Ligand binder design. Structure first.
Ligand SMILES: *C(=N)[C@H](C[C@@H]1CCNC1=O)NC(=O)[C@@H]1[C@@H]2[C@H](CN1C(=O)[C@@H](NC(=O)C(F)(F)F)C(C)(C)C)C2(C)C
Ligand SMILES: *C(=N)[C@H](C[C@@H]1CCNC1=O)NC(=O)[C@@H]1[C@@H]2[C@H](CN1C(=O)[C@@H](NC(=O)C(F)(F)F)C(C)(C)C)C2(C)C
Lengths: 302, 302
């Protein structure tokens, strides 16, 4: 028993983290096969970041302007290209520890582990949910750019995120491994707004199933609701509307506990309408939406 | 910016996890040099665990009764011995990926990362604090025993915990790597009481400094308190008394923010007597005590 926010084991990804330096700017890079991926703003000075012309800035850089280090080994840069907001540096050595991998673009509501790195050295791991407004609540200091987000399915590493910046609100933004930002953000030091956010309804329900599995049942009630009635309440409390596809995704948890999705929706409706009134669920005084149904099943089975 | 509960990168420990089977019972083992460390109840059947005589049970086992698998490779056991609640299996092969390590006994209030494992295979990583009543709030299912807790200091892994059992309150209990239980617990399937817990005062203070560093200041003011007067209030709210040694440990965070320890104590004393009043601190409606002063320094400057 016990339910905790858990990251994937990071060993496979630690073996791909390298340090990338261009002039006086140092950040992290991801070394897969003979290519090192990193944020393109590695070519910027602090002054350039206010209004960069990346195309012109890169034209002034040669392969020798990029120093890539894996541990204490210099990887010779023999080619460079920019794809969206990502810089791809071709190096003279293939990473011998390149795991089986894919580059994926995750959907809002989905989770991933972030291996926070500085100077190409991993310092910590934590889980993030991609908010409906395409931001994440991370922990990133100066030099953390190039740190990656990923999921592991047995032996294959699905890289989904690369860290690029922090918004005025304190939340974080980045790209997929093709260098396309999640959200409307740009890699320029200028105030940018993330949209109004919403609560990930299906994740709240998955977390209530995790709570019941752990013996936290005080919120269970003898009522059942309907999908349409629950959606009237959801809109008022800024919760995403529940769809039949989300009800289907909750199937395995509903089956493991013998608690119907609409029985659990009546618990959620009551929690929203009356408030939690200082009470707790799985140690939390708030309804948590950062766990997917797959995260809950993965943890409740092994 | 940002503050997140973060585990150490797990790669160095993943390379040490093995599967240990004895008869019908399978759990995890930790492979360092030519020794495999695992919980001694691997020699128990379900009925044996009710009231085991471990010495008698171990007499009945030989080296060939222990099946040890590192991935898809069997490691031959050539010696065995029991040290407290841990079984030490000498194997014919030294782990070629043994990191630089040490075995440490952690103090209550300190934190460590847990690499949760099943059948010798890592599944996830999360941070735990050793509660003042010597329990941890983890996530462990059947077969999780033998999973270890650790801290990493640059290249050295300090192993401090090995999982053995779950208590009636849903909390977890285990030993150091020498097999000595943390707390008054025994490796027997019998009802066992964990003592009354207390809040780790120095850790709440460290987290309040992390909140200030991240922009929260509503709880700050010019009021102060003596070390003695704060302790009179702390005792009422089941918080540990704050000592001058704890005040000294908070010194680096106090210097960084320019907020004296007793000034933060006055804010904490105020937060306990007056409540938060609908507000949050670092995305939480409750005061958190699972971050040490070192955990905060690591993220809020490191
Ligand atoms: C990469 N190493 C850092 C990570 C930042 C540092 C503090 N917390 C983080 O997540 N990325 C940057 O410094 C990027 C970089 C220029 C400016 N920058 C920012 O994150 C800035 N934010 C923005 O300009 C904004 F609002 F648009 F997101 C900063 C004010 C420094 C936090 C570029 C090229 C985006
Ligand atoms: C080792 N793989 C498991 C881990 C347990 C399984 C469920 N959650 C866990 O963390 N350890 C055990 O099953 C140990 C083992 C016998 C009984 N046991 C327990 O944890 C039981 N608890 C106790 O009897 C108690 F309360 F005293 F701690 C159980 C009821 C199965 C949760 C031995 C030898 C201690």
């Amino acid at each position: 028993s016990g339910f905790r926010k858990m990251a994937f084991p990071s060993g496979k990804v630690e073996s791909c983290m390298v340090q990338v330096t261009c002039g006086t700017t140092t950040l992290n890079g991801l070394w897969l096969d003979d290519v090192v991926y990193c944020p393109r703003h590695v070519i910027c000075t602090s002054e350039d970041m206010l209004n960069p012309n990346y195309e012109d800035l890169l034209i002034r850089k040669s392969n020798h302007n990029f120093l890539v280090q894996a541990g204490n080994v210099q990887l010779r840069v023999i080619g460079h290209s920019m794809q969206n907001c990502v810089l791809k540096l071709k190096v003279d050595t293939a990473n011998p520890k390149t795991p089986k991998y894919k580059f994926v673009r995750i959907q809002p509501g989905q989770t991933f582990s972030v291996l926070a790195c500085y100077n190409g050295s991993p310092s910590g791991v934590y889980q993030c949910a991609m908010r409906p407004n395409f931001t994440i609540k991370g922990s990133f200091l100066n030099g953390s750019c190039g740190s990656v987000g990923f999921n592991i399915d047995y032996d294959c590493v699905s890289f989904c995120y690369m860290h690029h910046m922090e918004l005025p609100t304190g939340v974080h933004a980045g790209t997929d491994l093709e260098g396309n930002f999640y959200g409307p953000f740009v890699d320029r030091q200028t105030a940018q707004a993330a949209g109004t956010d919403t609560t990930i309804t299906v994740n709240v329900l998955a977390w209530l199933y995790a709570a019941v599995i752990n013996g936290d049942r005080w919120f269970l009630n003898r009522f059942t609701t309907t999908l349409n009635d629950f959606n009237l309440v959801a809109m008022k409390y800024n919760y995403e509307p529940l769809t039949q596809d989300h009800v289907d995704i909750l199937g395995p948890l509903s089956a493991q506990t013998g608690i119907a999705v609409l029985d659990m929706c009546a618990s959620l409706k009551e929690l929203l309408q009356n408030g939690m009134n200082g009470r707790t669920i799985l140690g939390s005084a708030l309804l948590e939406d950062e766990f997917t149904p797959f995260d809950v099943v993965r943890q409740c089975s092994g």
